[PDB]
């Protein structure tokens, strides 16, 4: 999958506007509640799954950094995420989960931008998370 010139501009624009860590932390809290099974492999969090918990915060910093690396070079995402893709399979996470985090992230984008998050913006975000989801599932052996 690939984003048009307009979609890439919007995504880079959003990334400059939002607080990377806070929005990511809230997206993780949301995925844990909406899709309960996702908490399974997060044993290090010792049952603390809220956005304001230190564990979630530390993990959110890792996730947002990876997303930023994707936004910086949308053409080499699949290649750059090879290791991370393998890393997730090793841990035991189901490929469909990647799509789920993409969904809770778009809900957080919607809550933040409200009415300015129109179909065109939503489509740009979805396309971005679909590219990220693809790159993370690609190296599953």
């Amino acid at each position: 999958v690939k984003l048009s010139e307009d979609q890439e501009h919007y995504i880079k624009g959003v990334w400059k506007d939002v607080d990377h860590k806070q929005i990511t932390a809230k997206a993780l809290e949301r995925v844990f509640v909406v899709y309960p099974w996702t908490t399974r492999l997060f044993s290090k969090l010792q049952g603390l799954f809220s956005a304001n918990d230190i564990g979630v915060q530390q993990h959110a910093d890792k996730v947002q950094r990876a997303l930023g690396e994707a936004i910086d070079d949308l053409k080499k995402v699949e290649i750059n995420f090879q290791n991370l893709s393998g890393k997730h399979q090793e841990i035991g996470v189901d490929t469909q989960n990647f799509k789920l985090l993409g969904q809770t992230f778009m809900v957080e984008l919607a809550l933040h931008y409200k009415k300015t998050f129109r179909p065109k913006e939503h489509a740009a975000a979805y396309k971005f998370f679909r590219l990220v989801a693809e790159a993370l599932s690609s190296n599953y052996h």
């Binding site: 949301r30 909406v34 778009m106 809900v107 809550l111 179909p119 065109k120 939503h122």
Partner: protein, 141 residues
């Protein structure tokens, strides 16, 4: 079925949906057509797919009115959704996956329009929509 906790949140949400049926429905459909253009093939009669298009507004109102109705019939959703299942399953041959793609769009419409959309409320709506998708796909079983 649906959990007590999830049941309560849904019962009340129906009052809001019914009141904003057209505006929300039109918004939900526009996102579906925007994110997944292949879905436009089902609407051969439509002339446009923007949220301002009168056809989209008329159809969107009917979808939302159907959803609000369903919130008042959570203990016998099969009997209530039977006709729509036949319409979508037998007549239109609507791909079950499409119901889920649409549910993900409806959730964003709600996040953009509701005063608040916590993970708990989002969770209840997701499970409710998952039930609807399952019943609308019943003609394939």
């Amino acid at each position: 079925v649906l959990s007590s906790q999830n049941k309560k949140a849904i019962e009340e949400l129906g009052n809001l949906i019914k009141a904003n049926a057209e505006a929300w429905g039109a918004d939900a459909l526009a996102r579906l057509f925007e994110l997944h253009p292949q879905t436009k093939t089902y609407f051969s009669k439509f002339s446009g797919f923007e949220a301002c298009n009168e056809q989209v507004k008329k159809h969107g109102k009917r979808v939302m009115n159907a959803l609000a109705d369903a919130t008042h019939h959570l203990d016998n959703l099969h009997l209530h959704l039977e006709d729509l299942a036949r319409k979508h399953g037998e007549n239109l041959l609507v791909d079950p996956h499409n119901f889920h793609l649409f549910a993900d769009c409806i959730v964003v419409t709600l996040a953009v329009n509701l005063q608040a959309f916590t993970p708990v409320t989002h969770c209840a709506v997701d499970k409710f929509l998952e039930l609807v998708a399952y019943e609308l796909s019943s003609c394939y079983r």
